[PDB]
RNA sequence: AUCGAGGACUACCAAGAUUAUAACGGAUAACGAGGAAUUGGGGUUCGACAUCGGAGAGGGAGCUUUACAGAUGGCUACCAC
RNA sequence: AUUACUUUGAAUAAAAUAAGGUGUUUAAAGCAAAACAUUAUGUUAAUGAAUAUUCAAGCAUGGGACAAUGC
RNA sequence: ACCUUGUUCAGAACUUAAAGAGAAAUCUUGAGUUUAUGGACUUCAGGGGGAGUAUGGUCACAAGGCUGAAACUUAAAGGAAU
């Protein structure tokens, strides 16, 4: 199922039987952090933690894959 | 080379003064940096009077914060008879690292060999090293 | 057809799977392969794989006894 | 007596060691005999296995050797001018290995660094820089 | 997630045989699953099978003939020494004349009666009555 | 213990003496000398049990101190002299010349000899070193430091010694065409032919010894003891001829 | 200094060493092993005590003799008899 | 390229366990003795269990399926 | 678009079983695939009381929360169904 919610969506692209950035897009985290004015929004203050926990997993992987520089760290 | 109170000279010093470098035993090629190098070390396995006796091990270099001496972490598995399953373990060994390996850094696999007690804990000596990846902090010997 | 060597276990282009896949496609130009099925069966206390290149819409070069046919 | 066992030291982890047995003669130590500068005086210490160590208490002369001229000649030591370990050895003129001593080149007619163990062998022997 | 593809396939085959189905389908097909079936085919427990390639570790269709009772995987593949065989046979198999173990040894994926003949041990994969 | 020990408990004695577990509390400790503690049979055990001449230790001291035993050419008067390998033992009074060889049962055996063949005894070189003043010498398995030797007498050969003279008669090299007797562990007391010696730089040297009957068994280089050259034995092998029956 | 490696000790310099894979500390009616009792398999409990290794001689300490003792059916002092 | 896994060994105190032999009147036991030469003689240079092991490490070797570590 | 019908994907549910499981009630999008016992991982329980009590630690302004025994006592306490 999904990474965080209990949804189970199976929609997928279907490559035929014939052979003839995402981390950047996940920084969404900026857009919510909107939070400066809606201080009482306890929902977006939770969905931000979910987004930030995703970033700490893509960074944790792009460093092992030696893609990102070893000094990378996401912050405001 | 000579940055200390006493004169730093090799254990086997002679005129032609020469540079002295024996070779250790079972097929460990002496590094180039110890042939043309001008360093002085009385505990280097190549250019001194420290042999390499029976036990020989290997491990991952972890700490390179002490002078000419490093810490080698050996990871193995221990078997428990009752559960018929293994468990991870580790033992740190403090080993001497001669200046013959200038490019040695934390996280590189190293083959070490036994010698006579060189300190309170140091009993092994580095023989050869193979480098590995980087972790944002290149800590050399 | 091309001529590439197979190493002894060199890159993925020098593996048996890739060479046979390349030979199959290059020897079959321009007709297209669109299916492969292997029908294992016990014969004389032995297993006999019978690879079948299906949907065709070799033994000398590669060595695979492969039957070629058309979809039902 | 002074002891040389490791049972009185802390572990590699900093943990204290809990004793099990009393002191033993195998790890026996002995008092230093700082061989100062003065008249000849050595003492024969009966070490382990009966062997005898000459313990030089005070010395004046040593058989210095010259590497260049391949000559070794006895000489009277004058003054300890440098010690690589403890500067207080210079003040008391204590003779230990590696001490830089100046000597008179009266038989050299034909600066020094000691290269022997006066507290073990029983006499001073060195060479010329 | 799918930790063990072999476990999923064997449990799919056992369920089909209980219902009396004529053939079964296994979505992810590996070399180990293909080689596990040959041990069951050589004993005539299953008729045959057909590895259909789908460019994505294609499926398998397995023909069953009323003979298999239960084929089960064993969780982490225990290292089985040759002296530990009859201990494992006495547990996982109904009788000394009926069952069949499967071991992945250095000589391929053998059963117990031919790994014993080949004089080798190895990790245990599973079993089938 | 504060020093060297003197007693030997019965159960701590080497197994290959076959001492009854209810015989007594202690076992005769073999004094030092040519042969090690576990490589030797004390002279008391040779006469009390192997030959049954003396029933107890009262009658063993009445014999050895009576100048009635000649270990090698010399004569020994120590009740617990270490009698080890093929070093010959002779009793002039009874006119018999034994010899202590091994056998397949991991036991020292007393092979009878004739008078002529008792005048010599084979030794195995242990090491060769250069003395001070360039006086080379070799050390045998008996602890003997022989004087100025042959230049080719290397570390692991076998020499022939004479009791009366003390010279070196014949010497056998260490190669792949020689007969060897075993002094080791599992292969102890077995005769065979050296066929292969595989070398590991680290710890040990492993030698594959092929038996007469085609049986092949390996061992450590230490336990190898060359007994002849070209499938020939220089001494009379024991009753079982160094053969092992599976 | 030692029979001898060694922070074993001294002088100078550096800040290092261990830890969730349990460091550091606490409990033991804890001397360790060969082994013993009971067991379908897996195991649980025990081992001062035959034999091997360690430690001690009322409690510490300090020493003499000799090849080996920090000896105690040797000595000195203190504590307790 | 190493490790892990598995197979053979090397090496490995005894007592103890399982165990081979042996009529202590049998048995526990012990590693003694006797079929026998009707025995000094010979069997006899008599037996001594290969005694198997023994877990966790350590050494070497045959194999690379299942696993682990980076290039 | 709203309604009627066929396929398919995802969600909250429902009905039948002569089958599977279980002590039974009952469960079936599992509480099935389990003495024919091993898919991966985490937490929790060991007769009933004493008791979420005493003490130690920590959090809170407070009420209180979290971690959490022992002495002693007793042959039952309890679950589903007739």
TrEMBL record, chain B:
PROSITE patterns: RIBOSOMAL_S17 (PS00056)
Coiled-coil regions listed: none
CDD domains noted in UniProt: Ribosomal_uS17
Domain Small ribosomal subunit protein uS17 N-terminal: 2-57
Domain of life: Eukaryota
Keywords per UniProt: Ribonucleoprotein, Ribosomal protein
UniProt keyword Ribonucleoprotein, yes or no: yes
One Gene Ontology molecular-function label: structural constituent of ribosome
One Gene Ontology cellular component annotation held by this UniProt entry: cytosolic small ribosomal subunit
GO biological process: translation
Pfam families with a match to the protein in the record: Ribosomal_S17 (PF00366), Ribosomal_S17_N (PF16205)
Family: Belongs to the universal ribosomal protein uS17 family.
Protein name, as recorded: 40S ribosomal protein S11, putative
TrEMBL record, chain C:
Domain of life: Eukaryota
The family this protein is said to belong to: Belongs to the eukaryotic ribosomal protein eS7 family.
Protein's name according to its UniProt entry: 40S ribosomal protein S7
Automatic annotation (TrEMBL), chain E:
Highest taxon listed in the record's lineage: Eukaryota
GO biological process: translation
SUPFAM superfamilies listed in its UniProt record: Ribosomal protein S8
Keyword Ribonucleoprotein annotated: yes
GO terms, molecular function: structural constituent of ribosome
Alphabetically ordered keywords of this record: Ribonucleoprotein, Ribosomal protein
NCBIfam families noted in UniProt: PRK04034.1
Full protein name: 40S ribosomal protein S15a, putative
The organism of origin for this protein: Entamoeba histolytica (strain ATCC 30459 / HM-1:IMSS / ABRM)
Lineage of source species: Eukaryota, Amoebozoa, Evosea, Archamoebae, Mastigamoebida
UniProtKB/TrEMBL annotation, chain F:
Keyword Manganese: no
Domain of life from the UniProt record: Eukaryota
GO cellular component assignments: cytosolic small ribosomal subunit
Keywords: Ribonucleoprotein, Ribosomal protein, RNA-binding, rRNA-binding
GO molecular function: RNA binding; rRNA binding; structural constituent of ribosome
Residues in Small ribosomal subunit protein eS4 central region domain copies: 94-168
Record-annotated Small ribosomal subunit protein eS4 C-terminal domain positions: 211-246
GO biological process: translation
Domain Small ribosomal subunit protein eS4 N-terminal: residue ranges: 2-37
Family: Belongs to the eukaryotic ribosomal protein eS4 family.
Protein name according to UniProt: 40S ribosomal protein S4, putative
